[PDB]
Amino acid sequence: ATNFFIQPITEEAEAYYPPSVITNKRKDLGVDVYCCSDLVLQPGLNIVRLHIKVACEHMGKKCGFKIMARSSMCTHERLLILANGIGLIDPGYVGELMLKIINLGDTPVQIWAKECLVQLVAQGDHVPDHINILKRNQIFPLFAPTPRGEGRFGSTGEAGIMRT
Amino acid sequence: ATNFFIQPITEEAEAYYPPSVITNKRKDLGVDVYCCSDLVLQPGLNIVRLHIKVACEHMGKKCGFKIMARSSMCTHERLLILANGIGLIDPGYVGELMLKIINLGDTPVQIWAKECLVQLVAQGDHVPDHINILKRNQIFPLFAP
Amino acid sequence: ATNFFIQPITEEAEAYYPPSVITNKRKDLGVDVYCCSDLVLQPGLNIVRLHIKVACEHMGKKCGFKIMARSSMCTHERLLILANGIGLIDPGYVGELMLKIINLGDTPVQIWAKECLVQLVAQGDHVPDHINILKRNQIF
Ligand SMILES: O=c1ccn([C@H]2C[C@H](O)[C@@H](COP(=O)(O)NP(=O)(O)OP(=O)(O)O)O2)c(=O)[nH]1
Ligand SMILES: O=c1ccn([C@H]2C[C@H](O)[C@@H](COP(=O)(O)NP(=O)(O)OP(=O)(O)O)O2)c(=O)[nH]1
Ligand SMILES: O=c1ccn([C@H]2C[C@H](O)[C@@H](COP(=O)(O)NP(=O)(O)OP(=O)(O)O)O2)c(=O)[nH]1
Ligand SMILES: [Mg+2]
Ligand SMILES: [Mg+2]
Ligand SMILES: [Mg+2]
């Protein structure tokens, strides 16, 4: 069984993420996630919050996942790419999901709160069975402190904490 | 057993996809796919058709797959990237594969029909055993809506 | 069990890859690898050598793996992307790992030998148990 757990962590996320269980009858690989706020992306790098904490679990164990562009993210009107190509979300991450979006155009670009620019894909590309939208308040076991915690964007250092 | 199935759906695709079964003796992860038409890529975003329907099957089940750039897609002469980083193809998708390619340069670039800019990779990165090039003029149930 | 094997093939790599066994207690998906040389990345495409040969094994069999940017590779100061999005390394490949990096900015940019810009990820995204740093030119 492959399940995603999404918890809204702002008032804005609560508009798009009511407490519910979503099934994946279509068997799509990706879980679309909302901007939740109207965005203005400047030419160059933009750091964008997704207003959610996410956990993935496969065969009953907490696992990693990937952030991938939707094919609709990039249009003639909006030349947007994920800076990191895909987002590699480590099993131990329990912070807010963030995006690095490059606007390749010369003009600032507007995104609606209701748009999904990206999709979450389980470690190993397993088709999700259920998407669990958790209550904003609750404590969830899978968000418990880890060695990584909310460490992201070079939190591990230049050498990679991995090191060698 | 991981198998790919490619059906050409245009006469342009029939030039590059003769009916056959390709084995993957080298155990490469990626299945190279042809442009099938010469194209000029304008600076900015370009929509490129791949002229094929594809199915992947793993352990007897229809699965998804991914479209990745070949390391040779991007040269000094042609600063090309996949707009979406990786193409994510759902198990239920039975239409023509399409690419969104960005030309990051100031100047239009020529691609040739016989070039492969991208490669297909099974859901979960399983090494393909066979690539079945299907006859153009059939309705295969694997491609049913 | 999922293990990486890194074999330095230059003296520059030897200086950053002393023989050793790294356990992945954090259970991170990616193995960070050094640039091993100071480099200046020009606007447009830059070919960057990683000074290493790498093997990945899963359940005692040699497998492929992938090269991805670290989320920290791209910043306001260094607008850097992997040209191919992710590098796909076939299980059959035994040569040096190479990068194609695009500087999207108008200005050259400095990268440092002790910097890791990219990470390796096993075929199938398996969490690595061990990273084995081998001796220079030591076979798998
Ligand atoms: O697109 C992303 C990518 C990563 N992340 C988070 C989760 C991930 O576990 C954490 C670390 O990502 P990387 O390991 O891929 N980047 P880096 O190695 O530079 O950061 P760190 O040193 O903290 O591991 O950053 C995002 O929120 N969005
Ligand atoms: O690079 C690609 C990506 C997707 N596709 C096809 C197959 C895929 O299952 C389908 C939808 O892909 P995305 O989820 O990335 N696009 P989006 O979410 O914007 O549209 P849709 O609502 O149809 O999923 O489009 C391509 O042909 N090439
Ligand atoms: O980023 C990369 C990508 C690939 N490689 C290596 C490993 C891989 O097995 C080999 C082939 O890569 P691609 O299949 O993506 N490039 P291409 O298909 O253009 O060349 P080839 O015909 O040699 O496979 O080059 C790298 O060193 N770095
Ligand atoms: Mg979609
Ligand atoms: Mg190849
Ligand atoms: Mg990291």
Author numbering:
A (entry chain A): 2 to 165
B (entry chain B): 2 to 146
C (entry chain C): 2 to 141
The authors write:
The α,β-bridging oxygen in dUTP was replaced by an imido group to form 2′-deoxyuridine 5′-(α,β-imido) triphosphate (dUPNPP), a nonhydrolyzable substrate analog and potent competitive inhibitor of dUTPase. However, surprisingly, there is no C-terminal β-strand swapping in ASFV dUTPase, and the aDUT-dUPNPP-Mg2+ structure provides definite evidence to support the presence of two-subunit active sites in the trimeric dUTPase. The ASFV dUTPase active site is formed by the following two subunits: one subunit provides catalytic motifs I, II, and IV and the other subunit provides motifs III and V. The C terminus (motif V) of ASFV dUTPase continues to reach the active site of its own subunit instead of reaching the third subunit as seen in a classical dUTPase. When dUTP and Mg2+ enter the active site pocket, the uracil ring forms hydrogen bonds with the main-chain oxygen and nitrogen of Met99, and the resultant hydrogen bonds can recognize and fix the uracil ring by imitating Watson–Crick pairing. The C terminus (motif V) changes to a closed state, closing the active site. Phe154 is conjugated with uracil to further fix the uracil ring.
Deoxyuridine 5'-triphosphate nucleotidohydrolase (dUTPase, EC 3.6.1.23) is a ubiquitous enzyme in DNA repair that plays a key role in preventing uracil from being incorporated into DNA. dUTPases are widespread in organisms, including eukaryotes, prokaryotes, and some viruses. Herein, we determine the crystal structures of ASFV dUTPase and swine dUTPase in both their ligand-free and ligand-bound forms. We observe that the swine enzyme employs a classical dUTPase architecture made up of three-subunit active sites, whereas the ASFV enzyme employs a novel two-subunit active site.
